Amino acid sequence: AQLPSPTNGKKWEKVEQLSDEFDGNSIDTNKWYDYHPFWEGRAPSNFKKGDAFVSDGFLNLRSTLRKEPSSVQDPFKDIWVDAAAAVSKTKAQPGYYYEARFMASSLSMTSSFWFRVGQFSSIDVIEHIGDPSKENRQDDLPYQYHVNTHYYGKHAGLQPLGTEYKMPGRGRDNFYTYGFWWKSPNELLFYFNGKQVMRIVPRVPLDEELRMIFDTEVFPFATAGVANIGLPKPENLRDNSKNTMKVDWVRVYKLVD
Ligand SMILES: O=S(=O)(O)OC[C@@H]1O[C@H](O[C@H]2[C@@H](O)[C@@H](CO)O[C@@H](O[C@H]3[C@@H](O)[C@H](O)[C@H](O[C@@H]4[C@@H](O)[C@@H](O)O[C@H](CO)[C@@H]4O)O[C@H]3COS(=O)(=O)O)[C@@H]2O)[C@@H](O)[C@H](O)[C@@H]1O
Ligand SMILES: [Ca+2]
Ligand SMILES: [Cl-]
Ligand SMILES: [Cl-]
Ligand SMILES: [Mg+2]
């Protein structure tokens, strides 16, 4: 995919420790955790180590059935979904350009690309609901590229600030390239297949380093930027043709000279 024009005659140079074509036999443990070392996941899902795995040219983030949801006390709370997460060992920094090309899962769970593990901020480039089980959301969520920022810690109290773009085709049917220029602490620019589509001026400067993350989550009710999407279906979690978010690659660049 094409990168923004570089500011002032600078050139883009790849940040190797945050970029990966995922074309090997297994995940590069110098660069990635294949689980989330800082968070267990969003009940009734928790991340299972290795449900994020490299194979067939992709970082694959698969969500599988841990327990029958009719077997646990409350399927909105008790853990019965094994979700996937990969988290960067190197920190993401203000100023860089980030882009991931991926096809969402076909589950009522997120396929997400975002930044956190900070002290006061998060940046969600996309939290895509490939196939919401609440069926009145099928004409909308599968086309949505929804970006968001969150504020906590010293800035708890501030509401999220986000926006969205309606894609021409469903996230679960396409590899699309979602791009994000952390251009300033006060200016985030978002790209869809190389075209600038969204802009957020964050409520306070996003000037702290964050880790970069791909994951999948169940949302048991509307919360932290996310609608009422429905719980996923065991028959889809069991199906490897539907249960996997596939990231063909992630590339990150900084301006040099
Ligand atoms: O043992 S604990 O139960 O965990 O208690 C100790 C506490 O740790 C705190 O911080 C975490 C806990 O509150 C934890 C419990 O599950 O939740 C962590 O936050 C995760 C979410 O709750 C939070 O909503 C969020 O999720 C992101 C959304 O905001 C957003 O950005 O989109 C993405 C992708 O969809 C996520 O859904 O952040 C999560 C953690 O992500 S991480 O990458 O930063 O790890 C809390 O951080 C300490 O604050 C607390 O004082 C307690 O000790
Ligand atoms: Ca690849
Ligand atoms: Cl792997
Ligand atoms: Cl599902
Ligand atoms: Mg793995």
Give me the numbers of helices (H) and strands (E) for the chain, helices first please.
Answer: 1, 18
The number of residues making up the chain comes to 257
**Distance separating alpha carbons of residues 208 and 205, to the nearest angstrom:** 9
How many whole angstroms from 51 Cα to the centroid of ligand 5?
6
Give CA–CA dist 80/69, Å, rounded: 6
Sheet of 210-215, strand order: 32-33, 85-92, 210-215, 110-116, 121-129, 144-151, 161-166
Residues 6+ apart with CB under 8 A from 48: 35, 64, 66, 82, 83, 84
Q: What angle do CA 162, 197, 228 make, to 5 degrees?
A: 40
Which residue from 35, 39, 217 has its CB within 8 A of the most atoms of ligand 1, so it is best to mutate?
A: 39
Structural contact between residues 60 and 98, judged by C-beta atoms closer than 8 angstroms: no
The burial of 133, by beta-carbon neighbours within 10 Å (0-12 exposed, 13-18 middle, 19 or more buried), is given as middle
Q: For ligand 1, say whether the CB of 127 is within 6 Å of any of its atoms.
A: yes
Spatial distance between the Cα atoms of 159 and 134, rounded to a whole number of angstroms: 26
Q: Which residues neighbour 197 within 8 Å (Cβ) at sequence distance 6 or greater?
A: 145, 165, 190, 191
Check if 124 has its Cβ closer than 6 Å to any atom of ligand 1: yes
DSSP string of 7-25? GGG-EEEE-GGG-B---SS
> What proportions of the chain, in percent to the nearest 5, are helix, strand and coil?
10, 45, 45
Contacts of 27 (CB under 8 A, 6+ apart): 34, 52, 53, 54, 59, 86
Burial class of residue 102 in the structure, from the number of CB atoms within 10 Å of its CB (0-12 exposed, 13-18 middle, 19+ buried): buried
3-state secondary structure of 225: coil
Structure's resolution in angstroms: 1.8
Domain at 1-257, CATH from 2.60.120.200, 3.30.70.260, 3.30.460.20, 1.10.275.10: 2.60.120.200
Identify the bridge partners of residue 82 per DSSP, sorted by sequence position. Answer: 46, 64
Beta-ladder partners of 85: 215
Method: X-ray
Q: Which one, of 186, 207, 39, 218, lies nearest residue 112 by Cα?
A: 218
CA distance 188 to 4: 13
Give the C-alpha separation, 96 to 226, whole Å: 26
